[PDB]
Amino acid sequence: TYQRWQFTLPMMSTLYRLANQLLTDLVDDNYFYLFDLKAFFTSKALNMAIPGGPK
Amino acid sequence: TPRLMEPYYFVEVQAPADCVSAVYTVLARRRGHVTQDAPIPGSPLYTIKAFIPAIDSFGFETDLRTHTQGQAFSL
């Protein structure tokens, strides 16, 4: 039925090395500061625009 | 000859070695001055110790965390 999976750690290392283009080089949530879902909801409720954010 | 006096905050900023010049850029427009720039032993992050006027300190943390792409942090 092909529902659950578990791998070994060199397999995960190789699949993480091959996928280096579709992934980001971020390490922590110090990025997305005032640029996440809750800040966008706050800018939605206050009817203001973040520079780079939606309108 | 009476004069007025304002409070000055002491500010310590934890930041990577690249955004230090951006910290010098941001503190330049809020009438402050950097007193100490010191590397942390055993860590690549630096510490910037400065004095700032308290009336200029509104939105200061937000200015650093916006201008240094969220890498610097201040108290």
Side-chain angles (χ1 to χ4, degrees), chain B residues 34-58:
Chain B
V34 176
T35 59
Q36 184 177 0
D37 192 0
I40 298 170
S43 180
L45 303 175
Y46 290 176
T47 59
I48 293 96
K49 295 180 182 179
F51 291 102
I52 196 168
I55 199 165
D56 296 334
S57 64
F58 296 105

Side-chain angles (χ1 to χ4, degrees), chain A residues 28-31 33-34, chain B residues 62 65-66 69-71:
Chain A
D28 52 356
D29 288 330
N30 282 317
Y31 198 77
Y33 177 69
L34 294 171
Chain B
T62 305
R65 295 180 71 188
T66 300
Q69 294 293 319
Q71 299 296 320

